[PDB]
Write an enzyme that holds these catalytic residues in place. Structure first.
Site, PDB file in Angstrom:
ATOM      1  N   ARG A  80      32.842  50.725  47.560  1.00  0.00           N
ATOM      2  CA  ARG A  80      32.690  49.496  48.268  1.00  0.00           C
ATOM      3  C   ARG A  80      34.246  48.620  49.238  1.00  0.00           C
ATOM      4  O   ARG A  80      35.546  48.928  48.487  1.00  0.00           O
ATOM      5  CB  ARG A  80      32.800  48.562  46.922  1.00  0.00           C
ATOM      6  CG  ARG A  80      32.211  47.154  47.364  1.00  0.00           C
ATOM      7  CD  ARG A  80      31.958  46.084  46.257  1.00  0.00           C
ATOM      8  NE  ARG A  80      31.712  44.718  47.409  1.00  0.00           N
ATOM      9  CZ  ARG A  80      32.695  43.443  46.888  1.00  0.00           C
ATOM     10  NH1 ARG A  80      33.328  43.735  45.490  1.00  0.00           N
ATOM     11  NH2 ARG A  80      32.794  42.393  47.368  1.00  0.00           N
ATOM     12  N   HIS A 126      35.472  38.921  52.846  1.00  0.00           N
ATOM     13  CA  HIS A 126      36.368  38.760  51.314  1.00  0.00           C
ATOM     14  C   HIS A 126      37.666  38.010  51.733  1.00  0.00           C
ATOM     15  O   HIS A 126      38.488  38.248  51.830  1.00  0.00           O
ATOM     16  CB  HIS A 126      36.966  40.508  51.458  1.00  0.00           C
ATOM     17  CG  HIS A 126      36.785  40.457  49.809  1.00  0.00           C
ATOM     18  ND1 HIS A 126      36.574  41.315  49.122  1.00  0.00           N
ATOM     19  CD2 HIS A 126      37.342  39.546  48.931  1.00  0.00           C
ATOM     20  CE1 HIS A 126      36.222  41.066  47.519  1.00  0.00           C
ATOM     21  NE2 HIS A 126      37.803  40.247  47.747  1.00  0.00           N
ATOM     22  N   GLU A 172      32.335  36.773  45.982  1.00  0.00           N
ATOM     23  CA  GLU A 172      32.566  35.706  45.446  1.00  0.00           C
ATOM     24  C   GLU A 172      32.809  34.095  45.589  1.00  0.00           C
ATOM     25  O   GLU A 172      34.260  33.429  46.135  1.00  0.00           O
ATOM     26  CB  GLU A 172      34.293  35.683  44.384  1.00  0.00           C
ATOM     27  CG  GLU A 172      33.792  37.334  43.408  1.00  0.00           C
ATOM     28  CD  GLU A 172      35.269  37.276  43.221  1.00  0.00           C
ATOM     29  OE1 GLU A 172      36.403  37.001  43.135  1.00  0.00           O
ATOM     30  OE2 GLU A 172      35.164  37.972  41.957  1.00  0.00           O
ATOM     31  N   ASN A 302      29.961  40.497  40.092  1.00  0.00           N
ATOM     32  CA  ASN A 302      31.496  40.917  39.464  1.00  0.00           C
ATOM     33  C   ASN A 302      31.675  39.717  38.270  1.00  0.00           C
ATOM     34  O   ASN A 302      31.848  38.994  38.172  1.00  0.00           O
ATOM     35  CB  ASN A 302      32.362  39.790  40.762  1.00  0.00           C
ATOM     36  CG  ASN A 302      32.689  41.189  41.996  1.00  0.00           C
ATOM     37  OD1 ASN A 302      31.433  41.682  42.225  1.00  0.00           O
ATOM     38  ND2 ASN A 302      33.377  40.440  43.065  1.00  0.00           N
ATOM     39  N   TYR A 304      34.959  40.129  34.880  1.00  0.00           N
ATOM     40  CA  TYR A 304      36.171  40.400  34.514  1.00  0.00           C
ATOM     41  C   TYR A 304      36.428  40.034  32.754  1.00  0.00           C
ATOM     42  O   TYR A 304      36.345  40.999  32.127  1.00  0.00           O
ATOM     43  CB  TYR A 304      36.892  40.031  34.825  1.00  0.00           C
ATOM     44  CG  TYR A 304      37.284  40.525  36.577  1.00  0.00           C
ATOM     45  CD1 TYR A 304      37.821  41.663  37.081  1.00  0.00           C
ATOM     46  CD2 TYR A 304      36.759  40.097  37.900  1.00  0.00           C
ATOM     47  CE1 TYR A 304      38.383  42.316  38.453  1.00  0.00           C
ATOM     48  CE2 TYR A 304      36.601  40.158  39.082  1.00  0.00           C
ATOM     49  CZ  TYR A 304      37.282  41.847  39.168  1.00  0.00           C
ATOM     50  OH  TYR A 304      37.791  42.224  39.936  1.00  0.00           O
ATOM     51  N   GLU A 373      32.566  44.675  41.801  1.00  0.00           N
ATOM     52  CA  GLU A 373      34.264  45.063  40.502  1.00  0.00           C
ATOM     53  C   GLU A 373      33.934  44.590  39.351  1.00  0.00           C
ATOM     54  O   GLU A 373      33.599  44.007  38.764  1.00  0.00           O
ATOM     55  CB  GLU A 373      34.185  43.453  41.582  1.00  0.00           C
ATOM     56  CG  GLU A 373      35.279  43.337  42.466  1.00  0.00           C
ATOM     57  CD  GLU A 373      35.602  42.474  43.306  1.00  0.00           C
ATOM     58  OE1 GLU A 373      36.218  41.367  42.778  1.00  0.00           O
ATOM     59  OE2 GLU A 373      35.685  41.874  44.697  1.00  0.00           O
ATOM     60  N   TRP A 423      37.418  48.167  40.438  1.00  0.00           N
ATOM     61  CA  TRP A 423      38.124  46.961  41.108  1.00  0.00           C
ATOM     62  C   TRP A 423      39.521  47.245  40.584  1.00  0.00           C
ATOM     63  O   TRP A 423      39.877  47.598  39.157  1.00  0.00           O
ATOM     64  CB  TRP A 423      38.339  45.819  41.165  1.00  0.00           C
ATOM     65  CG  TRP A 423      38.805  44.666  41.561  1.00  0.00           C
ATOM     66  CD1 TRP A 423      40.543  44.259  41.589  1.00  0.00           C
ATOM     67  CD2 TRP A 423      38.783  44.706  43.121  1.00  0.00           C
ATOM     68  NE1 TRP A 423      40.823  43.808  42.596  1.00  0.00           N
ATOM     69  CE2 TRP A 423      39.830  44.412  43.903  1.00  0.00           C
ATOM     70  CE3 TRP A 423      38.361  45.228  44.530  1.00  0.00           C
ATOM     71  CZ2 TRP A 423      40.530  43.620  45.132  1.00  0.00           C
ATOM     72  CZ3 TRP A 423      38.034  44.602  45.434  1.00  0.00           C
ATOM     73  CH2 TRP A 423      39.175  44.110  46.265  1.00  0.00           C
ATOM     74  N   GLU A 430      47.318  41.051  45.308  1.00  0.00           N
ATOM     75  CA  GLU A 430      46.750  39.907  44.622  1.00  0.00           C
ATOM     76  C   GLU A 430      46.979  38.731  44.802  1.00  0.00           C
ATOM     77  O   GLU A 430      46.999  37.524  44.189  1.00  0.00           O
ATOM     78  CB  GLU A 430      46.062  40.016  43.046  1.00  0.00           C
ATOM     79  CG  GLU A 430      45.584  39.338  41.934  1.00  0.00           C
ATOM     80  CD  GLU A 430      44.139  39.917  42.039  1.00  0.00           C
ATOM     81  OE1 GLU A 430      43.498  40.882  42.604  1.00  0.00           O
ATOM     82  OE2 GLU A 430      43.178  38.811  42.392  1.00  0.00           O
ATOM     83  N   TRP A 431      46.104  38.562  46.497  1.00  0.00           N
ATOM     84  CA  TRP A 431      46.553  37.051  46.804  1.00  0.00           C
ATOM     85  C   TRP A 431      48.127  36.359  45.725  1.00  0.00           C
ATOM     86  O   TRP A 431      48.663  36.359  46.696  1.00  0.00           O
ATOM     87  CB  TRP A 431      44.668  35.925  46.262  1.00  0.00           C
ATOM     88  CG  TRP A 431      43.987  36.920  46.779  1.00  0.00           C
ATOM     89  CD1 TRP A 431      42.716  37.932  45.244  1.00  0.00           C
ATOM     90  CD2 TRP A 431      43.752  37.291  47.471  1.00  0.00           C
ATOM     91  NE1 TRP A 431      41.649  38.273  46.059  1.00  0.00           N
ATOM     92  CE2 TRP A 431      42.278  37.847  47.306  1.00  0.00           C
ATOM     93  CE3 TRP A 431      43.590  37.354  48.852  1.00  0.00           C
ATOM     94  CZ2 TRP A 431      41.554  38.696  48.413  1.00  0.00           C
ATOM     95  CZ3 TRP A 431      42.796  37.870  50.079  1.00  0.00           C
ATOM     96  CH2 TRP A 431      41.884  38.378  49.976  1.00  0.00           C
TER      97      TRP A 431
END
Length: 471
Positions: A80, A126, A172, A302, A304, A373, A423, A430-431
């Site tokens: 992906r 994204h 997201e 997604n 987590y 993810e 992921w 990471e942003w």
């Protein structure tokens, strides 16, 4: 205690890894790529915790052969990745010049992937909105122009990549809406009590428009499928003896996930959201509702972590976006969700993964599900010597328990999950956290030319899925 004669997961079960364009590619101005809102956002002081950007990242734009070789060595069946909008249409508009180089790049990449025997799973958006669209008409804030521009962009990609069967519209949308227009921690860093609800509505309509075009013109060409990817962490009552906390935990899920999934499967936003947000939550025009309702061939998920949810006595404030609840890692009794990671919001809770899989299935009539993810950061991992970073034992256990929790959900509850994407393939940008937070199964030596070293977890997935997947 394992049954001797179980069928295990279907043979065509997809598994692999997931990345995002801006987080790994670099080459931000190469081959005619235009600026995205994240390019400009990183230019603003103090917006990125470690003062970095995605100017280089993992340099994946120039190392497509490398990443594919890596994937093939980890036994990944599927991959992906997302496509940089401003690489295709640098200004983003439906009347703006198309960059053939950007098209050819991804076209060549899909070919290289397919030759390695790896199925591409492509994310259209994204978060890297072309900066020009933001300047031209307010970008995601525009209810008229953006869904039209995204529709065209999707169509250009559907047409340019005829070999791709698996498509994702938005990744997201909640993270584009609230961090980008509510708290301002993500691009374009705006802060408002109304704009996140406006953006989320526009993202849904844009999604529906792309899905319509795909189903009408491109889907039947190679028996493809398309859907949106929604994140969401599961919930548990802070005090289960308090019915308000039970109802609050459920309400939180509605504000997190049903926000987008209810219009897509049922036709409108949850009543709990309309109650709190009122006129701030847009209403679907007959046309918009037609686009959105039933616009998911599959459910992209997604996931987590999970949380304890406590109801709030005071009324909801204008800046509230969670549903007037307290998001916690400890319940009234003093139990903890899980251990710490490098992410303050992430704590391992494999049971929540299965619970979310079931929650989605029961609410939306057990749809086709793709885990697009899963992953975790590791506490103080960035401070570790290279020798010890590769000992991804914490992350190994994370994947081992989450994947097995997924297995139970699939084989017991009968959750129609068809795929699982870890992921991430490698440590990346990471942003707002920068490169400090590592989510990858592969270590990237940023100081020594971003060289790729597969951590322990990267090697653990192939044997695990060989055990869980039928022959």
């Amino acid at each position: 205690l394992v049954p001797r004669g179980s069928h295990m997961l279907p043979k065509d079960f997809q598994w692999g890894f997931a990345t995002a364009a801006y987080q790994i590619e670099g080459a931000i101005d190469k081959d005619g790529r235009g600026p995205s809102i994240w390019d400009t956002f990183c230019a603003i002081p103090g917006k990125i915790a470690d003062g970095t950007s995605g100017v280089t990242a993992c340099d994946s734009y120039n190392r497509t052969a490398e990443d594919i070789a890596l994937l093939k060595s980890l036994g990944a069946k599927s991959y992906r990745f997302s496509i940089s909008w401003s690489r295709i249409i640098p200004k983003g508009g439906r009347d703006d010049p198309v960059n053939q180089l950007g098209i050819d790049h991804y076209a060549q990449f899909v070919d290289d992937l397919l030759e390695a025997g790896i199925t591409p799973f492509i994310t259209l958006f994204h978060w890297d909105l072309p900066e020009e669209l933001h300047q031209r008409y307010g970008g995601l804030l525009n209810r008229t122009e953006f869904p039209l521009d995204f529709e065209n962009y999707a169509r250009v990609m559907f047409k340019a990549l005829p070999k791709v069967r698996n498509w994702i519209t938005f990744n997201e949308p909640l993270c584009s809406a609230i961090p980008g227009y509510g708290s301002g921690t993500f691009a374009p860093g705006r802060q408002s009590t109304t704009e996140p609800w406006i953006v989320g509505h526009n993202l849904l309509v844009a999604h529906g428009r792309a899905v319509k075009v795909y189903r009408d013109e491109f889907k039947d060409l190679n028996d493809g499928q398309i859907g949106i990817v929604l994140n969401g962490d599961f919930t548990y009552p802070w005090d289960s003896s308090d019915p308000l906390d039970r109802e609050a935990a459920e309400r939180r899920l509605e504000f997190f996930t049903a926000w987008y999934a209810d219009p897509i499967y049922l036709g409108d936003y949850p009543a709990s959201m309309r109650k709190q947000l009122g006129d701030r939550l847009p209403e679907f025009t007959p046309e918009e509702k037609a686009f959105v309702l039933g616009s998911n061939d599959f459910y992209g998920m997604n996931h987590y972590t999970s949380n304890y949810i406590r109801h709030r006595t005071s009324p909801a404030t204008a800046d509230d976006t969670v549903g007037n609840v307290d998001v916690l890692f400890y319940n009234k009794e003093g139990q903890c969700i899980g251990p710490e990671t490098e992410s303050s919001w992430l704590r391992p809770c494999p049971a929540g993964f299965r619970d979310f899989l079931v929650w989605i299935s029961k609410r939306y009539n057990y749809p086709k599900i793709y885990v697009t993810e899963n992953g975790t950061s590791l506490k103080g991992e960035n401070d570790l010597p290279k020798e010890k970073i590769l000992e991804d034992d914490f992350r190994v256990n994370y994947y081992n328990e989450y994947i097995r929790a997924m297995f139970t959900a699939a084989t017991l509850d009968g959750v129609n999950v068809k795929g699982y994407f870890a992921w991430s393939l490698m440590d990346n940008f990471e942003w707002a956290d920068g490169y400090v937070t590592r989510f990858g199964v592969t270590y990237v030596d940023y100081e020594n030319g971003q060289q790729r070293f597969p951590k322990k977890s990267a090697k653990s997935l192939k044997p695990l899925f060989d055990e869980l997947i039928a022959k």
